[PDB]
């Protein structure tokens, strides 16, 4: 319902609220299915590379999948 109502948001805050809602939906997916969560994580990272929680969660999921074989990514994020 929040995503449906996002169409009525003022354009100034529309980008920020869309990013927030997509992050929340990606969290719900990560609870349900990690693949869609990672997809939305990539979508938001392309949309806003400056956000940290998205990158943290994406790298954390990658480390879970790669058994901590992305130490370079963690160092770069640090």
């Amino acid at each position: 319902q929040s995503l449906e109502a996002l169409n009525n948001v003022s354009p100034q805050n529309k980008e920020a609220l869309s990013i927030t809602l997509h992050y929340n939906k990606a969290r719900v997916e990560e609870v349900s299915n990690q693949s869609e969560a990672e997809k939305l994580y990539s979508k938001l990272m392309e949309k806003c590379p400056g956000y940290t929680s998205n990158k943290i969660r994406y790298i954390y999921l990658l480390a879970l999948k790669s058994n901590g074989n992305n130490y370079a990514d963690v160092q770069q994020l640090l």
């Binding site: 980008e15 920020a16 806003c48 400056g50 956000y51």
Partner: peptide, 6 residues
């Protein structure tokens, strides 16, 4: 520096 991030 991004007003969007702020």
């Amino acid at each position: 520096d991004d007003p969007l991030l702020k």
